[PDB]
Amino acid sequence: VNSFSGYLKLTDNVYIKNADIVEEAKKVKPTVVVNAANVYLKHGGGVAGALNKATNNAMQVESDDYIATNGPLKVGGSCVLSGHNLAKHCLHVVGPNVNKGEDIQLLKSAYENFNQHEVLLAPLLSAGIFGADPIHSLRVCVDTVRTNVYLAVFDKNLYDKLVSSFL
Ligand SMILES: O=C(O)C1Cc2ccccc2C1
Numbered sequence: 001v002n003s004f005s006g007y008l009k010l011t012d013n014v015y016i017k018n019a020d021i022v023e024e025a026k027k028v029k030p031t032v033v034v035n036a037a038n039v040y041l042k043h044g045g046g047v048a049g050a051l052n053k054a055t056n057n058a059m060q061v062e063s064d065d066y067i068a069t070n071g072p073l074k075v076g077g078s079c080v081l082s083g084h085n086l087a088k089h090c091l092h093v094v095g096p097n098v099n100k101g102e103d104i105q106l107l108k109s110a111y112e113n114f115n116q117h118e119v120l121l122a123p124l125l126s127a128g129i130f131g132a133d134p135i136h137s138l139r140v141c142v143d144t145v146r147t148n149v150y151l152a153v154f155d156k157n158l159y160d161k162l163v164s165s166f167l
Contacts, residue, residue, distance in 0.1 A: 002119060003028045004150045010166055013148050014141060018159035021047060021123055021152040022054045025086035030150075033083055034114070034122035035059075036130065037092035039072040041079075046129045047154075055084040063092070075102050076109030091117060098131025107137065111144035119148045128154070138162055 007015035017024070025033045036047040041063035043052035052059040062081055073079060078093040095110040096102030110125050124141065126132035134153075141149065153159040 002148075003030075004121075007150055008163060010138075011142055013146060014151065015149070016138075016151045016153060016159070016162065018154075018156050019152040020050075020154055021121065022050050022086070024121060024150075024152045025051075025083075026054070028121060029087060030083075030119065030121040031088045032091050032117045032120040033087035033089075034120055034125075035090050035092045036123050036125060036128070037073065037078075037094050038097065039075060039077075039094055041067055041073070041092060047123045051086065051090070054086060058082075058084050059090065076106040078110075078113035087121070091120065093122075093125060095125035095130055095132070095137075098126065099129070104132060104136075107132065107140045108144050111141055114141075114145045114149055115147055117147055119150075121150045121152060123152060123154075127158075134158055134162060135165055138166065 007017045009015055035051050043060050073094050075094050075096055081090050083090045093110050093113050096106040107126050124134050124137040127134035127137045
């Protein structure tokens with residue numbers, strides 16, 4: 001049994017809810033919240049900007065030190081950093097950004113990072129301002145992630161479209 005409430009069950013392991021991931025993290029304090037990161041961990045906008053704002057910029061301070069030491073992530077890759085006030089840990093995952101021209105086949109590789117964690121609160125990778133089709137992102141998620149994932153979708157209109165169209 002876990003703390004996640006109000007989710008619709010899509011499969012054995014994937015659950016979905018219309019929710020602000022920031023507000024959901026604040027309530028649940030999950031072991032792992034996923035950030036929709038870029039390779040530079042520059043948390044300017046979208047989910048990353050919102051998560052970072054909720055940490056009072058501490059996520060960005062920590063991230064800048066991580067990049068200064070380790071250099072940029074790979075598209076499709078990830079790193080585990082602090083969850084600050086939102087979660088125990090933040091898994092920063094880089095999905096391909098279609099608005100920068102990145103290979104969408106890298107979306108499966110991005111979701112494979114989730115399999116290293118038993119339970120996660122996450123957004124749809126590459127969706128929103130990353131330019132991918134969120135329906136596609138949800139299909140790759142379900143067909144790739146084997147661990148228990150709680151997907152928070154910010155847009156209500158999109159949530160309803162994702163549920164109604166889910167196979
Ligand atoms: O409505 C949503 O949940 C989308 C908003 C957003 C922004 C940047 C990255 C992913 C997503 C998912």
